[PDB]
Structures are given as structure tokens and as C-alpha cells.
Design a protein around this ligand. Structure first.
Ligand SMILES: Nc1ncnc2c1ncn2[C@@H]1O[C@H](COP(=O)(O)OP(=O)(O)O)[C@@H](O)[C@H]1O
Ligand SMILES: Nc1ncnc2c1ncn2[C@@H]1O[C@H](COP(=O)(O)OP(=O)(O)O)[C@@H](O)[C@H]1O
Ligand SMILES: Nc1ncnc2c1ncn2[C@@H]1O[C@H](COP(=O)(O)OP(=O)(O)O)[C@@H](O)[C@H]1O
Ligand SMILES: Nc1ncnc2c1ncn2[C@@H]1O[C@H](COP(=O)(O)OP(=O)(O)O)[C@@H](O)[C@H]1O
Ligand SMILES: Nc1ncnc2c1ncn2[C@@H]1O[C@H](COP(=O)(O)OP(=O)(O)O)[C@@H](O)[C@H]1O
Ligand SMILES: Nc1ncnc2c1ncn2[C@@H]1O[C@H](COP(=O)(O)OP(=O)(O)O)[C@@H](O)[C@H]1O
Lengths: 231, 235, 231, 235, 231, 235
């Protein structure tokens, strides 16, 4: 596995490491595209552990999770980090399935199969939360508070991923900063990456910063005035 | 193999560089405005295979995931998923790991994980979707072409002379003017095409416009005659 | 196939013929029992083409349409006219299935089977619409505006189908005309057909014109006053 | 084989000619008023086989379509579909091509199309249905028979003397008077039957009427004693 | 089969016996735990007849009832008493399935199997109703009006089932009587049975009379004042 | 094999006699207050096998009914069904004949009826359920233990000294005070445990309390700093 590029905003990586070894289930909280998913993949490799990602949604059922085997069960048998992305989207009654894996009992009853699986001692559930869950689900997790990084830091992230000089990346950040009166950092990476293809700066921002997020016209010409301030 | 497409703006070059960065694109705009044909033109201009998916609700994970979306990932082909919003959401999130820096779709159950070809790109069409999904895309905004260009397209697609096409656009122009004033959506370019070809076959122009431009988009009688008023002035 | 009796009210039959040969999908719009279904069957035989009828409803799914093969697919392979009656009743997300058959692309992706079918060059979709659909579905169709025919004409239709003299048929029409302050022409055919069995004229109308349509009592004795005007 | 039926109106002759024209009939009216028994009497009087279908929601297309509805089409038998409104709607529309001038049900999947026998007729029962379906039927309106006739039926069905039957109808009469004033629906003839036969077996008439005429139709206590007041006057 | 202990409150047992032999379907109406289910089992054995109980619920379907064979069908073939407990809870469209068994026609169409079953001449449907059904379902049944028995009688029932002296049972009844400003008689049996285990009288009532029924705090200290009146 | 449990009240003796009468018990109270561990302690103290069921919605009749609930009936073991309300209702009513005087579960389809062992007991957990089901149970009301006892539990479970545990409880005390004033539910004992063990591993106590006591239960910022104020006073 190649190492995923994650730039630490604060002390979130040792808090996770501490939390991981300490048996406790982790919850990541923040807006869209603030590096939550990437953080997991960075910790998954840094701790030298397998990674299984689950894109949760409103139509996902329990048997999609445990099997008919399923991702959650596989993640339980082999020592893997099970990342339930977008936990809010999923039906909240399909998530109580993970409850036998989150407290001191660490097993998964596949009562359709008549089997009680072992939880590989190196197993942990991490979930993504933006920005509702049950209290019997919330209060079984430790929580990290993620957010869009400091302007200097985000500018470093954009330049590294999109492939543009600092001066352009700072402008993308300053535009984005005022744009969130959330707006994914990935959209800034897209914008810069387009500029790295000889695309008009405003057009690059129009494609990524004003069009994918809102279909309100007078919205756009409020964000396309702030793009014209810097670019 | 160039499919007929007339650019209204910088969409051809913007999508070009948009593909050069392998960025997931979203085509936004009204129905029948050239979105589905724009992809074909770019798939030809960028010189690469194209796989089209018509998204409905009875489209499970399996059929999207031997799977067409999986095929475009192997070959390195532009994957155009038309009308994504209609598809149930356990599909919309299937494309999520293909929108990451990873470039990878998980062929679970069946076996291995699939790392996509460097020439692969995912394209969707859009007028719901979550902000988690919308912000994974770059976006181009399509609207009905200006009278000059639109008439050229109609004339070419309908097989009618320039004069007839201009009048058809003129009718469509007077009808798009009425959105929020009686129409849920202005007149499509597709219906403009539909009209000229009835005319190109000898059908009375007033009748041809009635069954393609007036009737399909309106049930209200007093504003349907308003469109009929327009037709009787240009034809 | 025996020819279905269709009496032309105006220029709807050459407009369909013109529209058919011209690749465009047709939509029939009008009240219940104004001869929409019959018109299709008349055009189906007159153009010497196979006919597949689909009774759309709120519980009909896409796999009921394309197959698990289905009617729509069969209609696509062999050169047939696929008539989707009562298109408003069906779930509007199950109808976007026909979209790949209605524009210039003319195919049907059976992604459950891994097959892309050819559209037999003599294939067309016609739908029944009373009196909502998506704009992405509406604006792919040409539309004919059907309605209950002129009094003289409907009287001819009733006499031909029910089997009664003109004088009785005119009365059924005049009653119906004022009854629609819709009311199917078929109910008039039923009424006359009962009169052709030695049934009291008012009783024949009571069974067909006032009872099947409304369960409001004071409604009935408003329609049973107009039946007593003519009969 | 004549099943016991007493005509309240011209329903027997109206249905007779209604069948002679092979017209789809609908029986409208309250529950337990003789609708399901009227069909049997006519199926006997018109001298023809009869197939009855009890429509619920777990009645797919297959079970209606070797299928009973298909059987009546082959043989030429009156097909009585009881409580149509309860059935899911992909069934209600199965009968549509059998209500046309065609007289034909499509046995799709399995094979051929099925042209029905000239002696076939479809009958439904009704107190929802679309106007597209309701206007495919002729309709007869059933209501509870007038005191003279109703008592004769009760006496015959219950096996009680004329005097007892009249009082039971009298109780039912005073209860149908209260609809919109405390009762969702008046007292059925079926419950009137139920009462006499408890009485025909030696059960105290006040108790017999209580568990058949009062209790099954009312939960409200102060109007339940209102019905109990009626019972204690005739019994 | 051992005889179930049922104490007759009034003339409900001969009315059932009379109703049973007289072909008519029976309905039991009353609050929770007033001896409705027990009454059926008492009549089932006293009439020397097999008994099949069905716990109706909002997710129960028709095929759960008739088979895929099912309980209702089995109860129809062999001469058994089919007891549909909690009929209000079930989907009311899944219960019209029993309609062909409740009138003079006594059959069950398994149209999925292509079979019309005989109704064993000794077959009857009894249902539990607390305290809505369709009129086409209601008016096919005879109805018995059950209720919590007279204080003297209920005290006899508690002493017999729980195993406590009269004086304790009367107190449980008097507490319960005022508690229903329903409250199951079974909760009184539980309370006394706990007292028969050396449990504090108020604690025994707290576990059964104030805690299982309400989660309102100021409710509890209104019922725990009346428990302190007698105990 | 005694699992660590500290009694807050008479729950151990009340459940003891509650089992001696073979009465179905319900454990009521907030999440993470020791309900699931109380059963284990009693299953050990009463000297008998224990089968635990985690109830979700995709738990049909079959998996509850070779079935664990059936197993506890044969063996004579306490059957703890955790979070019953989450389970679909055709399961909640499966336990109904096991709550009667009969003591019997019907293994239908598969065959015979199953009479349970005299040592069998059914236990559920609860904070919906019908009154028909709730009144089939005896009930014990659990709440978070008083500061003395709670700190002892935290200290034991967290592996921290008495002083640290008391402060953690103090923080939890100041947070349970805020329910109805900004919090949907007070701080669990489980999160109190979670905090001490980060501290028992060298994590900064202010950070440890932040990610276990503050962050998991609050999204509102101005009252999240209110909890942060509390943390900065005790740590
Ligand atoms: N430390 C970081 N903070 C913020 N964004 C980052 C960081 N490191 C990488 N990114 C970029 O953010 C983009 C989106 O992050 P993502 O994993 O989608 O966040 P989320 O899971 O919260 O949506 C990635 O493409 C990545 O390049
Ligand atoms: N450059 C163009 N701009 C607009 N419309 C065009 C252009 N070229 C062709 N068309 C016509 O406009 C119609 C647009 O419909 P299509 O692109 O197939 O679906 P949609 O636009 O809804 O994705 C086509 O029928 C086509 O004949
Ligand atoms: N030209 C016509 N106009 C109106 N009604 C007609 C015509 N020709 C036949 N009919 C009669 O109308 C009846 C109902 O027509 P139908 O096909 O049900 O219309 P729809 O499909 O709009 O409900 C048929 O039984 C037919 O006999
Ligand atoms: N001519 C009649 N009119 C009214 N009721 C009758 C007549 N003949 C018999 N009955 C009795 O009335 C009851 C009507 O119920 P039934 O006809 O079976 O169901 P429904 O009337 O709801 O279709 C029957 O139980 C029958 O005993
Ligand atoms: N005659 C009676 N009246 C009231 N309760 C009784 C009677 N006989 C027994 N019981 C007790 O009532 C308890 C609950 O009765 P149950 O069958 O649950 O009533 P329901 O079916 O109305 O809920 C039983 O445990 C039984 O011991
Ligand atoms: N006697 C006790 N009272 C309260 N909490 C306890 C006790 N003993 C242990 N605990 C701790 O409290 C937590 C309670 O969670 P648990 O009992 O497993 O779930 P729940 O209480 O939600 O059923 C456990 O993690 C356990 O470490």
C-alpha cells in the first residue's frame, strides 16, 4: 500500500493512535471533504492495518453489512479497520448491528448462519459523522472534531494535490473561506488542477466552486464576484 | 465517426482539460439541450471508448458493478451515467471510491479490487443527490443555444431550410419566456427537431408545431392557445 | 387480426401515420373512454404492425417492463407498437426505463442480463395520458389531443357498437353531454346495449350513467332528472 | 340447486339482460346485504358455471392469471371477484382486456393469448378503484331489503318464526337509523341471521341480540345501551 | 392437555358454547389481560378441540397466515379453533383472507397452490379485539364483552395463580382498581408471586404495577402513594 | 467467573426473587448504565447458562426461533434479548407464548411445540413496544450510580486511581444536570470509563475528556465549551 498524503492540522493523529490501542471505537466529525476519509487511510497504513470502507446510505440493510458474507464480518474476522463513511445517511436501525462490536463484548451474531464470530484483537470500527444517530450508538464512540484546516495549511494541501504554485492555492483558499458564508477541500483541488491545464482561473473556479454546489443563479454571481476579487 | 455537435460556449475545451486532469464531470441543464450528445462528441474528439448507463431505480449494485462501470475502469473509457438522481442510492455511492485519488472500484463478493485505467473518466448528468456526492464532481452548466446556433442545429437535425428552423426557434423563444408564468420548463431542442421533420415530410406546419411544441408541454387550455397564437404568426 | 371500429373525429389518423414513419414517439391525451386505446389498435392494424398493450399502474416495476423477458423488450425486438396505457398511474421512476427507446439512441440495456438489444426499425412507443409525468419524459413525445367527439359523431359510434337506432343513441349522448357537468363513451355503449335487451330506458341509464361513476345520492337525482328529460 | 334469494327490486331481470349483453357488472352496497348470494342465484338461474375469487393483497398476477379468471374465460363461466378494492392494482388492471370489445386475457410468460368463451362474464363487488376501472362496469345498487322481505329472509335463513324475524328486523331498523349519529354503518342482514339462530337454539333473545346486533358494531357505551334499550322493548 | 384455570365472571362460557355449535365466528372484546386468551384455551379443552394461536402484528402478511402451509390453513383442515390474538395490530388487508372462512362459504382459496380446502365441520375462528377493523370484518362476528372482573372475583384469581393469601390479593386488586384511573390482571399475579418470594410489598408492586406501564415519574409517585395506602 | 458488578440498589435481590418466580424481567434505563452487565452478574450468581440476543430489524422469526431463544428454552438458561424495541414486531410476539403460564414456544414449520425447561427465563432491555407486550414483564428501573459507587466502578473498569475517577464522575455529574437544557441524554458510564483509560495510558486528561465526554454527545458549540469549562476546572 502506498502512503496517502495527510497533512496534520492539530493533534488528531496521536489521539487516534492512543484511542486505537485503547480498544475504544472512534468517530470522525466534520464537514464534507475536510480529510476524514483520508485520515483513516493514513492511520490504517501507519498502524500497518487492513482497511475496509463502507459507503453508508438510506437503502443499506443489515444483511448488506453482515452478509447473506459481508464487509463488516470480514473486517471482524481479519484484523481490519472498518470505516463506515456517512453514518448519518444509513437507516439507524441497521447500525445497531455493529453494537455487539463496539462495547466490551466483541462479537457479531450471524443468527441467519448460526455462528458467533471472534473479533480479531486488532479490530476497530471508525465512523464518519457530518456534522441523527441514537444515544445508544453515539455514546459508544470516542470522537475527533475535524474541520477545514487553517488557511495556510489548506493552501499547502491544495498545492501538493492539485499541483499549482502557492499564490494560486492561497487564492483558492481565500475564495473558499468566504464562500462558506460546507465546501469540500476536494473542490479546491479540482480548481487548481484545472488551472494546471491552462484553464482560465475564473472558469476553473466556476466549474468547481460555484456550479457543483448551488443551482441558485444569484448565489453564483455572489461567488463569482469573490473569484474576481483574487483572480 | 464525429457525432454532430455545435458548441454554444467553451464547453468543448473546458471538458477537454477537465478530462486531462481525470476529473469527474457533471453536465447540468434542462432536458434535450445536447448533454447526452456532447459526451459522444467529446468521446470522439478525445479519441476514446464510451460506455453509457441509463440509470433507473431497478438498477442494483451488481448490474453497475462484467459490469459496465467496471468495464470502463478496465479499458480506460469515459463512463457516462445518464440521469443519476433516478438511481437508488446504493449505486450513487458505488462510484465514490472511483472519484477518490485512489481511482478504484471494489468488485466485492466476486473477488479482487479493481484499479482503473489511467484513461478512465466518470461523467454524470443532472438537472436528489447529497452534497457528499455533488462536491465530488466538476460541473458544466448547459442551456439552450442562442437563436443563431440553435437554428443551425435544428436545420441540420431536422433536415429543413434555415428559414424554417429560425421560425421554430422563434416559437421556442416565445415559450421559454413563459416559465414561472405557466410552464414548468421551457421548450426542448428535441421537440424543435421533432417539429421540423414533420414539416420536412409535408405535414402542415401549424399541425406539426401543435403536436410537438404546444401539446406535449401544456395541459392548460388558455395558455395553450397562447402558444397556438405564436404558431399562427410564424406559420 | 380483425379491424377495430374507429370513427375519425378529426385529422388524428394521418398525423399519427406521419409521426410514426418519422421516428417520433407518440402520446395520446384525453379523458377516459374517448377512443384512445381503440385508436392505437386501429393504427396498429392499418400500418400492419404487431401490438403489445401495457396496463400501467402504481405497483408496476421496471423488471415487470423489461423482464426478469418482459413486454417492452419483446416489443423492441420484434417490430411492434408498445402501448403504455394509463402512463400517469405508473411510478414515474419506472418509466425512465423507456427513455433509451424514445430518443435517437434506440436500445434497451438489460444490465441484469448483460445484453444491449436492437430496436427493430419498425418499433415505436405510444402512451396514454389523462388528462404527472417528468419533463424529461414529456418532451420526448409528440402529442395528440383526444376528446369526446362531436354529438353527431358520438351518436354514430353508440349506434354502431351498442346496436340501437339513432334516436336512442342521440338521447344517450345528450344525457352524457350534460352529465359531464369524465364520462366514458363506453358507458353509453353499455346503456344502449341494455336497451337492446328490452330494458327500461331510465333503468338502462341508471345502471351505466349514474351508478358506476358516483356514490353521491343527490348527484344521482340530478343525473336521473336529465335522463327523464329525454327518455 | 337454487340458492335461496329473495329479490328486493328488478335486480334479477336487470342482471339477466345485463348478462345477455355480456356486460361486466358491479354489485354496489353495504356488507352482508345479499350481494355474494345474488350472484349464485343468477349463476343458477342463467344456467352456467360460477368461479368465485376472494381478493386480498397477496394476490399476485399469476394466481389470478390454470388461473381461475383464465378458467372462467375458457369454460364460459361467470367470474365473481369479491372485494376487488382490497386487491393490489396490478390485478385490477389484469381484467382490463377482458372488459374490452376484444374479450381477451393475455396469458403472457406462459405463452398464448386467450380468447374468452361467449358465455363468459366478469362480476365484481364494491362498497380504491380508479375511474378508468369503474367506468368499465355496469352497476346495480344493493341496499338492505324492506321490513317485509327482510324478515322473510331472516326467518328462512335463521329458522325462526315470522314474529321473531320481524322483531329482529325492527331492531335492525332502529339501528340503521343511527348512521352518521354514532354508527359507521347500519346493521347487516348477516348479523340479523346470526341472532335468530341463537334464539332458534334456546339462547335468551336479549343475550342473542346483544352479542350479534349490539356488541359487534359498537364500542361506545352510551349508544350501545341505546341499542340495548331497543332490544329490551321487542324482547 | 391440562385444563387452564378460568374463573367465570358472568355467562360468557355458555354464550360461547351456544355460539360455537351455531356455526358463528366469535370475537372477544376487552382490555389487556382480562382473561381473553385464557378463556379460549378453556373453551378449547372443554369442547375437546385442538387450538392454534396466532399473534397478529403490523408486519404479518397473508402468506404468513395461509402458507407459502400456514397456521390458518392447518386450523381449517384439522378441526381446530383458530385464535387470532391482537387482531387490531395486524394489517387490515391481510385479514380479509379469513373472510371465506367466516360466512356460509367455508373454504380457503390457496390460489398460489391451486387448491380449495375443505373446512373441517368442527372449525371456528375466534379473535381478540382491544378495545380499527373493517365493517365487512366486524359484522361477520358475534362478540363477547370482556372486562376486568369484579373486585372479589379478581382477588380469587390472583390468590389462585400467584399463590398468596386473600388479604394480600385484595390489596393488589384495590391498588389496581384505582390505578386504572388498562392494567393487566397478569401484573397483579406477578406482584403477588413476588410477595410469595419474601419481597417487600411495595417493591413487589413497584416492579409490576408502576414500572412496566409508565415511564412518567410523577405518574409513579401517584401510584406509589396508593400502594402505601393498603400496604 | 464473576463479572464485575456493583449494586446501586436492591436490584440483585429483587431480580433473584424475580427469577425464583420465573417472571419475565425488563431492565429499564439509559444507555451504558450497567444493564447488560447486570444480567451477566445475575446469570453467574444464580448459577445458570446465559444466551444473549442483539435485536435488530433484519432478525426474522427463524433466527430467533437451532434458534437461540429455543436453545435457552431447552437448556433452561436466562435469555437476555438486548434492545427489543429495535426488532421488527413479528419477533416481539414470538416471545408471547413464552411469557404465558404455558412456558412454551411453537417451533412451527420445523415441527413440534417446545415446552421450556423450569430453569428458563426471558430478559429484555428497554429505554416502540405495545402495552400488550410491556405488561407481560416485571420491571427494574436502572439509573446512573451515585458518585461514590460510580467512581469505584470507573476506577475499577478504567484502571485509574480513586481521585481521577471522582473527577470524571464530577464532570459527568455537571453534564447530566443539563438534560432538557441542551442535552438529549446525560453522560454514560461507558464514556466515563473510556476517559480514564486514555488517562491511564498517558493521554492529556483535558484531551481524553474532550474526545469521550464532550465531543461524542454534543454538536452545539457554545454548550460544548460549557462542558470544556467543567473539564478545565477538574483537570
Ligand atoms: N490534512 C488534510 N486536510 C484537509 N484535506 C486534505 C488533507 N489531506 C488531504 N486532503 C484532501 O482532501 C480531499 C477530500 O478529503 P476526503 O477524504 O474526501 O474528506 P471527507 O472524507 O471528510 O470527505 C482529498 O482529495 C485530499 O486530497
Ligand atoms: N450542439 C447541440 N446543442 C443542442 N442540441 C443539440 C446539439 N446537437 C444536437 N442537438 C439535438 O438536441 C437534442 C438533445 O437531446 P439529447 O442531447 O439526446 O438529450 P439531453 O440533452 O437531454 O441529454 C438531440 O435530439 C439532438 O438532435
Ligand atoms: N372514434 C371513437 N371515438 C370515441 N369512442 C369510440 C370511437 N371508436 C370506438 N369507440 C368506443 O369507445 C369505447 C371506449 O374506448 P377506449 O378504447 O376505452 O378509450 P380510452 O382508451 O380513451 O379509454 C370503445 O368500446 C369503443 O367501442
Ligand atoms: N335476498 C337476500 N337479500 C339479503 N340478504 C340475504 C338474501 N338471501 C340471503 N341473505 C342473507 O344475507 C347475508 C348476506 O351476506 P352475503 O350475501 O353472503 O355477503 P355480502 O352481501 O356482503 O356479499 C347472507 O348471510 C344470507 O344468509
Ligand atoms: N377469569 C379470569 N379473569 C381474569 N383473569 C384471569 C382469569 N383466569 C385467569 N386469569 C389470569 O389472567 C392472566 C392474563 O390473562 P390473558 O390470557 O393474558 O388475558 P388477555 O388474553 O385478555 O391478555 C393469566 O395469567 C391468568 O392467570
Ligand atoms: N455496576 C455497574 N453499574 C454501572 N456501570 C457499570 C457497572 N459495572 C460495570 N459498569 C460499566 O458501565 C458500562 C455499562 O455498559 P453496558 O452495561 O455494557 O451496556 P448497557 O448498560 O447500555 O446495557 C460498561 O462498559 C461497564 O464497564
Amino acid at each position: 500500500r502506498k502512503e496517502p498524503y495527510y497533512r496534520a492540522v492539530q493533534d488528531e493523529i496521536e489521539l487516534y493512535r492512543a484511542g486505537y490501542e485503547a480498544r475504544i471505537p472512534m468517530m470522525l466529525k466534520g464537514p464534507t471533504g475536510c480529510g476524514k476519509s483520508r485520515f483513516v487511510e493514513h492511520m490504517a497504513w501507519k498502524l500497518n492495518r487492513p482497511l475496509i470502507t463502507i459507503a453508508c446510505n438510506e437503502d443499506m440493510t443489515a444483511s448488506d453489512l453482515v452478509g447473506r458474507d459481508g464487509p463488516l464480518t470480514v473486517a471482524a474476522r481479519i484484523g481490519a479497520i472498518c470505516y463506515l463513511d456517512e453514518i448519518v445517511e444509513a437507516r439507524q436501525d441497521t447500525i445497531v448491528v455493529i453494537h455487539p462490536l463496539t462495547d466490551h463484548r466483541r462479537v457479531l451474531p450471524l443468527e441467519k448462519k448460526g455462528e458467533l464470530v471472534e473479533a480479531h484483537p486488532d479490530f476497530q470500527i471508525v465512523i464518519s459523522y457530518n456534522p441523527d444517530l441514537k444515544q445508544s450508538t453515539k455514546q459508544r464512540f470516542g470522537a475527533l472534531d475535524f474541520d477545514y484546516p487553517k488557511p495556510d495549511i489548506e493552501a499547502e494541501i491544495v498545492s501538493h494535490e492539485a499541483g499549482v504554485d502557492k499564490d494560486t492555492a492561497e487564492k483558492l483558499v481565500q475564495i473558499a473561506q468566504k464562500a462558506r458564508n460546507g465546501l469540500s477541500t476536494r473542490l479546491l483541488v479540482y480548481a487548481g488542477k484545472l488551472i494546471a491545464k491552462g484553464v482560465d482561473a475564473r472558469a476553473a473556479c466556476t466549474m468547481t466552486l460555484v456550479n457543483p454546489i448551488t443551482d441558485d443563479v444569484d448565489m453564483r454571481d455572489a461567488l463569482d464576484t469573490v473569484v474576481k476579487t483574487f483572480f
